[PDB]
PDB file of C-alpha atoms and ligand atoms in Angstrom:
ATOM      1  CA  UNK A 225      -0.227  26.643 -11.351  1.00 11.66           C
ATOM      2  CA  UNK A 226       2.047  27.859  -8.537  1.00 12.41           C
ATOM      3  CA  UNK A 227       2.988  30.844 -11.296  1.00 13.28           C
ATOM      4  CA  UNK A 228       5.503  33.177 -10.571  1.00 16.60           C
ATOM      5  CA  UNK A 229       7.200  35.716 -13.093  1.00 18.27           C
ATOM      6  CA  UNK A 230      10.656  35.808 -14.389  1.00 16.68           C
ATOM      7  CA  UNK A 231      12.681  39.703 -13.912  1.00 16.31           C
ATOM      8  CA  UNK A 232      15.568  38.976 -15.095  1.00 14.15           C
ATOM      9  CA  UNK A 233      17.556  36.547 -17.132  1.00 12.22           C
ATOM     10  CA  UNK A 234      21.609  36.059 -17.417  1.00 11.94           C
ATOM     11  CA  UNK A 235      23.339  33.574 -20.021  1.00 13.80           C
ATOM     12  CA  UNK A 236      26.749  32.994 -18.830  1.00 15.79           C
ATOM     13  CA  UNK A 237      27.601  30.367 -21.625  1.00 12.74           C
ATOM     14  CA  UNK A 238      25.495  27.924 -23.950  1.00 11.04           C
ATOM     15  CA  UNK A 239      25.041  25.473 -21.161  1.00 10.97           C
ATOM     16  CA  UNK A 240      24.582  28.153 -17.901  1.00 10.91           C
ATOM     17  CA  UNK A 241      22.415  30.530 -17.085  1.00 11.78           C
ATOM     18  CA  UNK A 242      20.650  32.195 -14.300  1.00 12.40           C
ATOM     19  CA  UNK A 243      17.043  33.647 -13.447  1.00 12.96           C
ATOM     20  CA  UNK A 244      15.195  35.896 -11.035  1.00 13.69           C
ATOM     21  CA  UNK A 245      11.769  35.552 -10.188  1.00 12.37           C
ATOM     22  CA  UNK A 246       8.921  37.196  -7.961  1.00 12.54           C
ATOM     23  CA  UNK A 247       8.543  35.391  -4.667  1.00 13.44           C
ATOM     24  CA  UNK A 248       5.660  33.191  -3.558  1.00 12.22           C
ATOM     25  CA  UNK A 249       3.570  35.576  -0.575  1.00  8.40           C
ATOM     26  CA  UNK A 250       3.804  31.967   1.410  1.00  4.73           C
ATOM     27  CA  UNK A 251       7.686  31.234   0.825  1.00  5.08           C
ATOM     28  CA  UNK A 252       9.194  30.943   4.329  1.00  2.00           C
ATOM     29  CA  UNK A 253      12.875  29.140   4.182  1.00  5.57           C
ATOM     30  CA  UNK A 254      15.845  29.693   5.433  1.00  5.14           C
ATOM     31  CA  UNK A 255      19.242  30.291   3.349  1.00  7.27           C
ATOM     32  CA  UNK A 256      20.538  26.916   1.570  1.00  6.92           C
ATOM     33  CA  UNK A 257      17.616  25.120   0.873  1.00 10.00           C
ATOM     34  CA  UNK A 258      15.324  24.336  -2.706  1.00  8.69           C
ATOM     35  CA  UNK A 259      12.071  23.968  -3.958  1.00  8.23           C
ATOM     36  CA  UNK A 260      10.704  22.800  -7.262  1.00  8.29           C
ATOM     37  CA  UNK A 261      10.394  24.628 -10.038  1.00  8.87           C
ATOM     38  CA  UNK A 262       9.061  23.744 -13.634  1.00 11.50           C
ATOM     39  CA  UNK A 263       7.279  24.382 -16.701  1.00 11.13           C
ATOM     40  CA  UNK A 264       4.317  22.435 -18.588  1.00 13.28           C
ATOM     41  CA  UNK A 265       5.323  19.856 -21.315  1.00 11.68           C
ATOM     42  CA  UNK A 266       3.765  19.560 -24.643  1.00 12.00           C
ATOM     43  CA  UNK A 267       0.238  17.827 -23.497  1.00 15.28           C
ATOM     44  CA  UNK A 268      -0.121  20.307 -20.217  1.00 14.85           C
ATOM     45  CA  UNK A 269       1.757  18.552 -17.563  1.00 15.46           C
ATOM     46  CA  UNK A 270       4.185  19.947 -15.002  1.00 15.19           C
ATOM     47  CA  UNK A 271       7.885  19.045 -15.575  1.00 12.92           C
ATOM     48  CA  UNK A 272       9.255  19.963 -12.094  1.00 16.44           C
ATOM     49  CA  UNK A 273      12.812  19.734 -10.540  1.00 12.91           C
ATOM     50  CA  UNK A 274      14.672  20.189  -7.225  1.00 12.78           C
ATOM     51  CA  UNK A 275      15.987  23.624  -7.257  1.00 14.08           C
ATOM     52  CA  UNK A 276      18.494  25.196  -4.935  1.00 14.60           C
ATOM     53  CA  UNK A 277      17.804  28.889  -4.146  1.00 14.89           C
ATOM     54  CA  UNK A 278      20.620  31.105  -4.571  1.00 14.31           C
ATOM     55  CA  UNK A 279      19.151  34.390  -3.402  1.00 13.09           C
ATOM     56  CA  UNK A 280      19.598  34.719   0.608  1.00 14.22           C
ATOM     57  CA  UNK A 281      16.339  34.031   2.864  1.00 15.78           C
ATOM     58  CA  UNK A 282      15.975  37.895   3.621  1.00 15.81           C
ATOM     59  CA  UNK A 283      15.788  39.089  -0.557  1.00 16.46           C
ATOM     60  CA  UNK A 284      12.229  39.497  -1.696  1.00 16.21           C
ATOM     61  CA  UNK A 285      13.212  38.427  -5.276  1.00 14.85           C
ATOM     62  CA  UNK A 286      14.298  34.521  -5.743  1.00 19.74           C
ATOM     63  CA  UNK A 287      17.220  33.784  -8.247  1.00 19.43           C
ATOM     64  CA  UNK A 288      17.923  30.340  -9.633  1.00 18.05           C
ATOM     65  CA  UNK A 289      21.435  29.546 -11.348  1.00 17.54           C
ATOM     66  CA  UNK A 290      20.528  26.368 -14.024  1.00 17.63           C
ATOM     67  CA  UNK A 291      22.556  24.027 -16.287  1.00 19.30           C
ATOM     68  CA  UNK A 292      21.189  23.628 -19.317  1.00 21.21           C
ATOM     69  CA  UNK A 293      21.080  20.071 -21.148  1.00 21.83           C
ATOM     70  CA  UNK A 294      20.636  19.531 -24.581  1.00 22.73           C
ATOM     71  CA  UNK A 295      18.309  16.613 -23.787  1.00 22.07           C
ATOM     72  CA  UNK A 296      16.490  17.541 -20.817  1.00 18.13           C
ATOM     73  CA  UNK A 297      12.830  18.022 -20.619  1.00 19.16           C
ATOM     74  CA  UNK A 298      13.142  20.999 -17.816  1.00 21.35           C
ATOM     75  CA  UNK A 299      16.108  22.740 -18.975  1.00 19.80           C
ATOM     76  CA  UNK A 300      16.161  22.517 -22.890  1.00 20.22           C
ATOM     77  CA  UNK A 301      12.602  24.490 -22.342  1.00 22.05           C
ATOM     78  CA  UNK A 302      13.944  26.319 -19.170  1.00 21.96           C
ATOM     79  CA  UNK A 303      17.248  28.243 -21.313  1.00 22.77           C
ATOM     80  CA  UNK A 304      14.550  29.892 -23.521  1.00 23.49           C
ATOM     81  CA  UNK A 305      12.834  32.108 -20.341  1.00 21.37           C
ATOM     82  CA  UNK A 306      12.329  35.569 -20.962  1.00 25.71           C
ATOM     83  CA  UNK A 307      11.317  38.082 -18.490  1.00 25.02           C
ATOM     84  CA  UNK A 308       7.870  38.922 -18.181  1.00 23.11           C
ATOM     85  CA  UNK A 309       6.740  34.922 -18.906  1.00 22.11           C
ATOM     86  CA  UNK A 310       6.270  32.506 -16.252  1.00 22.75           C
ATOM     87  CA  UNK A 311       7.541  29.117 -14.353  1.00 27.51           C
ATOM     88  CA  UNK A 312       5.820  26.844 -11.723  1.00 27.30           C
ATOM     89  CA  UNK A 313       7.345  27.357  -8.655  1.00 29.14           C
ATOM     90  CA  UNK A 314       6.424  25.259  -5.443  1.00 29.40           C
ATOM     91  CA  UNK A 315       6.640  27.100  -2.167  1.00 31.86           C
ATOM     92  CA  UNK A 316       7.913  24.106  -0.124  1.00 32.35           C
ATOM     93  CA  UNK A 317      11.537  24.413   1.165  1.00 34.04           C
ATOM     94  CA  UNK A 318      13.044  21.478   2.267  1.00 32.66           C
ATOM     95  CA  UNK A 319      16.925  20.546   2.003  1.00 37.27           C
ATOM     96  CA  UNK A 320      20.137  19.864   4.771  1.00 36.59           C
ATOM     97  CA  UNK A 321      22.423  22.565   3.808  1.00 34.85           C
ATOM     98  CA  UNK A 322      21.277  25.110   6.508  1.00 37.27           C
ATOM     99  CA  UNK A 323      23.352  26.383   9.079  1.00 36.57           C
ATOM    100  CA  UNK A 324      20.730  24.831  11.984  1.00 35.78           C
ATOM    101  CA  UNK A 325      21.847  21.352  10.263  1.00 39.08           C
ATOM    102  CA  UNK A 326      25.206  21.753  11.881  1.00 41.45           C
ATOM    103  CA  UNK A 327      27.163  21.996  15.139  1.00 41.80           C
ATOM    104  CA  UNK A 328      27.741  25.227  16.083  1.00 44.35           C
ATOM    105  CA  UNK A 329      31.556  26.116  15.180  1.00 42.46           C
ATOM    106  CA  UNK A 330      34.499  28.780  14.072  1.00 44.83           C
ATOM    107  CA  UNK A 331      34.340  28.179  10.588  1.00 42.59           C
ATOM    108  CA  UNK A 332      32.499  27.531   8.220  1.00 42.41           C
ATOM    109  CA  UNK A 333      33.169  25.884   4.627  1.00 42.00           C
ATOM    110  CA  UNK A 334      30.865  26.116   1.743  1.00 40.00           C
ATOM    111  CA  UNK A 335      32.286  23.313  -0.973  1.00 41.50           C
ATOM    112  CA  UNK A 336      30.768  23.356  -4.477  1.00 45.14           C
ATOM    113  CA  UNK A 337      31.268  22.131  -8.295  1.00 46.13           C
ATOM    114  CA  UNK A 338      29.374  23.605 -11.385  1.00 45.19           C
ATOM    115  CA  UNK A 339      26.176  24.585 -10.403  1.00 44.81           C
ATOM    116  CA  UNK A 340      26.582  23.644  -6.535  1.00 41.56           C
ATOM    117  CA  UNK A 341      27.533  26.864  -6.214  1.00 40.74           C
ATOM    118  CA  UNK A 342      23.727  27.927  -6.204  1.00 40.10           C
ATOM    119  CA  UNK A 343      22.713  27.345  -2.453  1.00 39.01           C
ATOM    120  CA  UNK A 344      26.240  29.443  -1.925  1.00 37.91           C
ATOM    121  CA  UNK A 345      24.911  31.699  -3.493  1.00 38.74           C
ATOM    122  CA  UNK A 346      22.218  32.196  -0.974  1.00 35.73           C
ATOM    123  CA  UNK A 347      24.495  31.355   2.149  1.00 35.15           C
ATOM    124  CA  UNK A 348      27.453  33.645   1.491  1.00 34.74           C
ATOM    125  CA  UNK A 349      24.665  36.607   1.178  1.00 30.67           C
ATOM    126  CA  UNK A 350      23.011  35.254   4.536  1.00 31.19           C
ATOM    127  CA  UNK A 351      23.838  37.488   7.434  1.00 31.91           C
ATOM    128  CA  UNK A 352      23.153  34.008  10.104  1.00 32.21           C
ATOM    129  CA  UNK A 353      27.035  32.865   8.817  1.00 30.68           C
ATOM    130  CA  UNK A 354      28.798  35.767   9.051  1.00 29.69           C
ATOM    131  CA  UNK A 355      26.536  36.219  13.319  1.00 32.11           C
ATOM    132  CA  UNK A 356      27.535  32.435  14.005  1.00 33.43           C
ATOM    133  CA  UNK A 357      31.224  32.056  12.036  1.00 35.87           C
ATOM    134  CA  UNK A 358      34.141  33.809  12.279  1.00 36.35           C
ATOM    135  CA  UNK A 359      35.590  32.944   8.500  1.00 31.82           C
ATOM    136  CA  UNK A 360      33.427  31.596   5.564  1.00 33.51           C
ATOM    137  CA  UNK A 361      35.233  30.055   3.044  1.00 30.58           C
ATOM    138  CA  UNK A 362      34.410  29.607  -0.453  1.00 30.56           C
ATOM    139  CA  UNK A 363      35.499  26.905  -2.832  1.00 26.97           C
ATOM    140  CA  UNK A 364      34.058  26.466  -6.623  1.00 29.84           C
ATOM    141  CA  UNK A 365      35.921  24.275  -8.820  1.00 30.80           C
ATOM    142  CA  UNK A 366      34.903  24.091 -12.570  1.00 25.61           C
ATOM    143  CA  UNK A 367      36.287  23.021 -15.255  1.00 26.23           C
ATOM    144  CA  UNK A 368      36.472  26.209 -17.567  1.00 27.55           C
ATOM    145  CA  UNK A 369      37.228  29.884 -16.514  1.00 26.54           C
ATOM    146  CA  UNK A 370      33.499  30.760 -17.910  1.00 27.13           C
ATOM    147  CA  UNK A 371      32.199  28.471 -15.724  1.00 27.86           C
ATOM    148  CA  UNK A 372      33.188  30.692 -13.021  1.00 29.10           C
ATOM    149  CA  UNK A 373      31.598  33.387 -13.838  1.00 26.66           C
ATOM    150  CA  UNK A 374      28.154  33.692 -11.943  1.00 28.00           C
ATOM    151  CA  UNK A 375      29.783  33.364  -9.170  1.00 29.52           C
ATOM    152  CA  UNK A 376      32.957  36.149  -9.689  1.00 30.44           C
ATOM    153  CA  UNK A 377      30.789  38.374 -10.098  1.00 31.74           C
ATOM    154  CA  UNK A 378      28.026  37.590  -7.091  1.00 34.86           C
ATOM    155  CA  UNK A 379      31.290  37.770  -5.125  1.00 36.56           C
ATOM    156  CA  UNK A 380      32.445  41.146  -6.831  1.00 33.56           C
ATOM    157  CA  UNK A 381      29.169  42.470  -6.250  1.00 33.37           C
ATOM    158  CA  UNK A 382      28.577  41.344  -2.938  1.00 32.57           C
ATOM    159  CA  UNK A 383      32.034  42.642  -1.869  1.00 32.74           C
ATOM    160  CA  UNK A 384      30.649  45.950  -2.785  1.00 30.40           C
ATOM    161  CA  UNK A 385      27.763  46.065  -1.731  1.00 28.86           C
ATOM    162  CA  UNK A 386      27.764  48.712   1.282  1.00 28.17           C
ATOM    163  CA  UNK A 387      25.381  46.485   3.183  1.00 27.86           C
ATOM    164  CA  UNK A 388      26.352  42.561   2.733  1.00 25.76           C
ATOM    165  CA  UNK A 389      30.009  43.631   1.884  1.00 26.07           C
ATOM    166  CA  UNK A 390      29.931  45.128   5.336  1.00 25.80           C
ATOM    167  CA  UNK A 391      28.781  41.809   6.634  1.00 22.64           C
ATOM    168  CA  UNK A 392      31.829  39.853   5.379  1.00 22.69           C
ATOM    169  CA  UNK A 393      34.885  41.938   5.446  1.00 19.82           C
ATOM    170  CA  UNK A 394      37.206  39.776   7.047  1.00 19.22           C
ATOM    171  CA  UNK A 395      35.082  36.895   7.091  1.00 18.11           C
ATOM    172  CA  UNK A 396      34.395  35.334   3.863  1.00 18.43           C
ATOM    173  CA  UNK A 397      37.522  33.693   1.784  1.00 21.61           C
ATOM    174  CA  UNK A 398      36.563  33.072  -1.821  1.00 20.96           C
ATOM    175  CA  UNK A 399      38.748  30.200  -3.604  1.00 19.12           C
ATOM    176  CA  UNK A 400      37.566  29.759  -6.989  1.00 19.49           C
ATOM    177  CA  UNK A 401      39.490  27.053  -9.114  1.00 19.58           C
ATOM    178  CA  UNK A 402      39.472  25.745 -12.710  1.00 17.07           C
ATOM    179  CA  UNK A 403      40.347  22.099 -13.207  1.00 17.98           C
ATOM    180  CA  UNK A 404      40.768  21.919 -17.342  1.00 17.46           C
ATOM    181  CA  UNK A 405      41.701  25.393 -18.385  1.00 18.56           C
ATOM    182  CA  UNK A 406      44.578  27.790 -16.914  1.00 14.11           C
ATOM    183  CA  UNK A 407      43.591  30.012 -13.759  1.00 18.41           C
ATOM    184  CA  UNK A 408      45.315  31.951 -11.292  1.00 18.51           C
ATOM    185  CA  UNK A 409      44.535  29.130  -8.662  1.00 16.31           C
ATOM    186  CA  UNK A 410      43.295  25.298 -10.076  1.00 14.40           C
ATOM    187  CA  UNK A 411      42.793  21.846  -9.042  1.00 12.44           C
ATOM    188  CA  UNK A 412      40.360  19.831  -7.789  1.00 10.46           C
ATOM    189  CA  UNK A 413      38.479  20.543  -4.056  1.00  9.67           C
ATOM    190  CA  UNK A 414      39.301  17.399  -3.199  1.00  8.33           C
ATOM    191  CA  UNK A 415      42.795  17.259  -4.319  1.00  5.32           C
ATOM    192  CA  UNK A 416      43.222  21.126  -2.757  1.00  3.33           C
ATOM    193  CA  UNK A 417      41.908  20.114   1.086  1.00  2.00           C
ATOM    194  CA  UNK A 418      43.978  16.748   0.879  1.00  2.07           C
ATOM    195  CA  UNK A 419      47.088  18.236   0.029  1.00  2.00           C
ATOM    196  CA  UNK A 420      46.550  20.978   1.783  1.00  2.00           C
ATOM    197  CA  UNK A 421      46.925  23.214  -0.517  1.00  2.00           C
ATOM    198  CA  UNK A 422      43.962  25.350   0.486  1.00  2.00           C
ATOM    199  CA  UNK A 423      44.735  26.061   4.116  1.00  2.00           C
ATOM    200  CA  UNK A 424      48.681  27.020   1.991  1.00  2.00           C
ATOM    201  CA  UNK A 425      46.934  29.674  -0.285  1.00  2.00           C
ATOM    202  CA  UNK A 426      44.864  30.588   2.627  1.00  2.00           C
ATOM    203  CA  UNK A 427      47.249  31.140   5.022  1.00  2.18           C
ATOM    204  CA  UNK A 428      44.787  29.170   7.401  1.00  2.00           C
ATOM    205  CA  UNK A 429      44.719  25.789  10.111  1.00  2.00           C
ATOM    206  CA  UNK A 430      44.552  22.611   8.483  1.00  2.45           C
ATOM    207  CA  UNK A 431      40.794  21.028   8.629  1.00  2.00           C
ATOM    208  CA  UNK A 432      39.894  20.023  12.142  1.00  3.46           C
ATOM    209  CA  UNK A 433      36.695  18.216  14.134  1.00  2.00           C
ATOM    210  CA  UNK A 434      36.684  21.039  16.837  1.00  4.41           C
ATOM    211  CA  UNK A 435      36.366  24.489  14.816  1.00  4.75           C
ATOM    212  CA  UNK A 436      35.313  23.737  10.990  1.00  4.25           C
ATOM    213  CA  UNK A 437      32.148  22.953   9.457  1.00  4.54           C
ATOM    214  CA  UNK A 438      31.200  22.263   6.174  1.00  5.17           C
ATOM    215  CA  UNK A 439      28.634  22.008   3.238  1.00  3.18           C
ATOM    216  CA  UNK A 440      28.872  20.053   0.422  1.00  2.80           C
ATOM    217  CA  UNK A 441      27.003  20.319  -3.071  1.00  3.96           C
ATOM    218  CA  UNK A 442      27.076  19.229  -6.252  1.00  2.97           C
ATOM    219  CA  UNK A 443      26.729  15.721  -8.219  1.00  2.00           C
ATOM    220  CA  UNK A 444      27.412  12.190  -6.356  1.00  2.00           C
ATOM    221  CA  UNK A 445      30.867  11.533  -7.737  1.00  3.88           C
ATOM    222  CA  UNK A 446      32.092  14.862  -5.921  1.00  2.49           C
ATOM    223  CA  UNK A 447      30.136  14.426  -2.615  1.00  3.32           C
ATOM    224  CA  UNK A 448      31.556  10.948  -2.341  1.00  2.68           C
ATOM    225  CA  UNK A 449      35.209  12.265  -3.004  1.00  5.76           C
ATOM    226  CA  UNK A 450      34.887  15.168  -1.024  1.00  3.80           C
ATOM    227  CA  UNK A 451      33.351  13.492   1.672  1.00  2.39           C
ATOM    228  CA  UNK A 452      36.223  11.033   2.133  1.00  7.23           C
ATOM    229  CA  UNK A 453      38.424  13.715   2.404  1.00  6.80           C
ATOM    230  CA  UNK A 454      36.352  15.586   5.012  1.00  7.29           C
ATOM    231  CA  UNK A 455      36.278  12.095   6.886  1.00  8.68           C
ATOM    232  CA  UNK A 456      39.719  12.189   6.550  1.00  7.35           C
ATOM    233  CA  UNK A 457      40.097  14.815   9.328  1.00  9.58           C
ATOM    234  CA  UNK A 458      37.877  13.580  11.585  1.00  8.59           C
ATOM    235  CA  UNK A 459      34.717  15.823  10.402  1.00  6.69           C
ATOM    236  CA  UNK A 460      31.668  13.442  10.362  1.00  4.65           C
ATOM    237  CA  UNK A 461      28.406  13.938   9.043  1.00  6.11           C
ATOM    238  CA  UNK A 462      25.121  15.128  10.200  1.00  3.26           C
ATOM    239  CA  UNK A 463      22.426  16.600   8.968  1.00  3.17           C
ATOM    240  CA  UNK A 464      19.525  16.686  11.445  1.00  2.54           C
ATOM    241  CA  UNK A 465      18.083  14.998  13.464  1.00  4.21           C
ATOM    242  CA  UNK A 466      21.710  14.570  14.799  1.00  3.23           C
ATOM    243  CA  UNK A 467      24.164  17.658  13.629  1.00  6.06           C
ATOM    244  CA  UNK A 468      27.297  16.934  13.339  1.00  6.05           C
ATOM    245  CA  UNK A 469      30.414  18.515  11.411  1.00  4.91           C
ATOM    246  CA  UNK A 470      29.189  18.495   8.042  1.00  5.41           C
ATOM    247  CA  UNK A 471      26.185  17.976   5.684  1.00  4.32           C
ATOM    248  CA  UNK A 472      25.963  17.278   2.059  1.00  3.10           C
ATOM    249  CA  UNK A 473      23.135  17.497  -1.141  1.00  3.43           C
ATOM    250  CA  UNK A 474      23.974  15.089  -3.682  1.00  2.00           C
ATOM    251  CA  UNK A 475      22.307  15.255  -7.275  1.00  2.00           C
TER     252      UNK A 475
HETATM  253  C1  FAD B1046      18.528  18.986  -4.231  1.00  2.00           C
HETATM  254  C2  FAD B1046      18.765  19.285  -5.698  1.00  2.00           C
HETATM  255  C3  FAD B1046      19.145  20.589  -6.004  1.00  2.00           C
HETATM  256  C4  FAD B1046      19.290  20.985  -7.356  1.00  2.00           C
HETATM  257  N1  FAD B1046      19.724  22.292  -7.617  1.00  2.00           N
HETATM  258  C5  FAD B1046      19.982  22.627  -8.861  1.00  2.00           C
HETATM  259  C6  FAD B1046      20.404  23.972  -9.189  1.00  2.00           C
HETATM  260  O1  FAD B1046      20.462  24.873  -8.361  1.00  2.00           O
HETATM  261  N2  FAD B1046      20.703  24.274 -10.562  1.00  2.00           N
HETATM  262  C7  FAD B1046      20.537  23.268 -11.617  1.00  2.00           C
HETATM  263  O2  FAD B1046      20.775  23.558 -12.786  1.00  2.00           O
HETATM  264  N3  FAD B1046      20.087  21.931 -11.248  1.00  2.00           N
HETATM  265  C8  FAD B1046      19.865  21.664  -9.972  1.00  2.00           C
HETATM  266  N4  FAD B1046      19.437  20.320  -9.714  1.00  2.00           N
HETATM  267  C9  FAD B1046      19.241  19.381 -10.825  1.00  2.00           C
HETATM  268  C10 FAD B1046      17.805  19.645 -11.359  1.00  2.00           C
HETATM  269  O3  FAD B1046      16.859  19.106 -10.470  1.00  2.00           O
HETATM  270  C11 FAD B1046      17.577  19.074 -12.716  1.00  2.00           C
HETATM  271  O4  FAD B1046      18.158  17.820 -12.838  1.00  2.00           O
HETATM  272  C12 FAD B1046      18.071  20.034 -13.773  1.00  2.00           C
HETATM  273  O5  FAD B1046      17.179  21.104 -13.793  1.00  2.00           O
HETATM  274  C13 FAD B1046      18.107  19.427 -15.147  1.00  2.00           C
HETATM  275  O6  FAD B1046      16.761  19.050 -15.492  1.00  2.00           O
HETATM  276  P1  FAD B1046      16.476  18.367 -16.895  1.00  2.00           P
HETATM  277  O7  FAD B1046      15.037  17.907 -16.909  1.00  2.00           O
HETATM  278  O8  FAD B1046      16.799  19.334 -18.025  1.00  2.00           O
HETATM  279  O9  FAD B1046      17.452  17.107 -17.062  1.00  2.00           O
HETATM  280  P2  FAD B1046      17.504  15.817 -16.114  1.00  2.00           P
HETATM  281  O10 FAD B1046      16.735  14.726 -16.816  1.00  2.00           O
HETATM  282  O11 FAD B1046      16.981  16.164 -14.755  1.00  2.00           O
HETATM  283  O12 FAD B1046      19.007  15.380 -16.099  1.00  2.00           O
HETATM  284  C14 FAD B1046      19.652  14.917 -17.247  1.00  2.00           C
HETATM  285  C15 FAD B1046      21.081  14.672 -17.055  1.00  2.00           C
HETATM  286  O13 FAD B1046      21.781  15.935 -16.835  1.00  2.00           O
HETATM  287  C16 FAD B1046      22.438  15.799 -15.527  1.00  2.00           C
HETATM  288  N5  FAD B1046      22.245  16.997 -14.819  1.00  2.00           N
HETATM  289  C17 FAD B1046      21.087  17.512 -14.418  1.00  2.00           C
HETATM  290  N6  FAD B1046      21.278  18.641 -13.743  1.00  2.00           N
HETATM  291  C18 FAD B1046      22.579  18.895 -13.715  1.00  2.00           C
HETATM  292  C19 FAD B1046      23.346  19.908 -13.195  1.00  2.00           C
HETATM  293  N7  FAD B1046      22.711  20.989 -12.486  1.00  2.00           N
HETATM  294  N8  FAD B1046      24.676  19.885 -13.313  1.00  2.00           N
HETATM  295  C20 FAD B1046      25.296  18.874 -13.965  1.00  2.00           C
HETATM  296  N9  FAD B1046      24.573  17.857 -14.507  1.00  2.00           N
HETATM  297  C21 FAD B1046      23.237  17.848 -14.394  1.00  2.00           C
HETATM  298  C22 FAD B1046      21.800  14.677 -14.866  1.00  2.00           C
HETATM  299  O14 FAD B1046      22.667  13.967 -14.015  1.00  2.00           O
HETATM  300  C23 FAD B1046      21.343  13.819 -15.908  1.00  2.00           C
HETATM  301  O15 FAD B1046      22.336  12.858 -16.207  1.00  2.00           O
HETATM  302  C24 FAD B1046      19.145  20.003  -8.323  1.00  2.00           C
HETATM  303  C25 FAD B1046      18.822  18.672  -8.016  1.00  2.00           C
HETATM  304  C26 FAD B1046      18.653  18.315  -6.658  1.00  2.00           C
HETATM  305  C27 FAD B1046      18.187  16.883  -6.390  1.00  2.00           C
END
């Protein structure tokens, strides 16, 4: 049933975890997008969601960063995988945060809450933004410090890494935030490009049509906020067929 095997599991709190798994032979995508992914329910049917993929186009291993909710049929199964046991995973990519779903540009914003981070995840690891941009830039805004924490340490790693960290020297600005609980930087994505306080701690232009570009994920309450700020300096959306200045994956 589209099985693939789990490698590796992290729990980062009660409510977030992450997962590697071994890679469909037919999986062709490109950094950004999601598939579906699921297990079987109680009387042998799938119980499949959209997934983003957070492991760049180029790694042979897939990883998956997942709420989990108390409720929910995937994901109060989906917190108890172990490696060695199985999930469903589809092999077809689809999805508009890819870098071919935007106008070419100077730089290049990835903007994420909670687990929106995931297709980030992927894209900061992808060498095509670091060929086609000259500064990546990072925000993650949470709520809670350990909400954070998948991605700290993807970025500590990656930073280190003698091959990716090569990549983005110079190039990729990481602005993680906290919203609820006390951090060295906080506030809302939103609230942080419309006051400006981001291009402040940055040291960096304000937001502009001509050089930025931007990706937006994460649930519909902060696409539609962040969108009107993003509208706000004249950056207008695309996707394709039509690229524009930015592109967003509501869930
Ligand atoms: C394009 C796309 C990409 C996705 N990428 C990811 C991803 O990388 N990681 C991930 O964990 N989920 C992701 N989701 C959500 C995912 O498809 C499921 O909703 C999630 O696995 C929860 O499934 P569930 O059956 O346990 O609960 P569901 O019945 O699907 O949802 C129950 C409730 O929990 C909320 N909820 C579900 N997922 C989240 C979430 N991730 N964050 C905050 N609230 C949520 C829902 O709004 C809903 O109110 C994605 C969804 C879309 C459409």
């Amino acid at each position: 049933p589209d099985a693939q095997t789990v490698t590796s599991v992290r729990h980062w709190t009660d409510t977030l975890f992450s997962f590697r798994v071994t890679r469909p032979q037919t999986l062709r995508f490109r950094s950004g997008e999601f598939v579906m992914i699921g297990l079987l329910d109680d009387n042998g049917k799938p119980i499949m969601r959209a997934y983003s993929i957070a492991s760049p186009a180029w790694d042979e291993e897939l990883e998956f960063y997942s709420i989990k909710v108390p409720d929910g049929p995937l994901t109060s199964r989906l917190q108890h995988i172990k490696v060695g046991e199985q999930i469903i995973l589809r092999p077809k990519p689809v999805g508009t945060l890819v870098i071919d779903a935007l106008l070419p540009g100077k730089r290049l914003w990835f903007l994420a809450t909670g687990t929106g981070i995931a297709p980030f995840a992927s894209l900061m690891r992808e060498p095509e933004a670091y060929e086609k941009f000259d500064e990546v830039i990072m925000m993650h805004a949470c709520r809670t410090v350990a909400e954070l924490e998948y991605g700290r340490q993807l970025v500590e790693a990656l930073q280190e890494d003698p091959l990716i960290g090569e990549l983005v020297e110079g190039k990729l600005k990481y602005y993680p935030t906290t919203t609820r609980e006390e951090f060295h930087h906080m506030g809302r994505i939103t609230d942080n490009l419309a006051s400006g306080k981001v291009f402040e701690d940055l040291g960096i232009a304000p937001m502009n049509p001509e050089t930025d570009r931007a990706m937006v994920c994460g649930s519909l309450a902060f696409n539609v906020d962040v969108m009107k700020v993003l509208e706000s300096y004249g950056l207008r959306e695309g996707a394709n067929s039509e690229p524009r200045e930015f592109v967003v994956e509501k869930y």
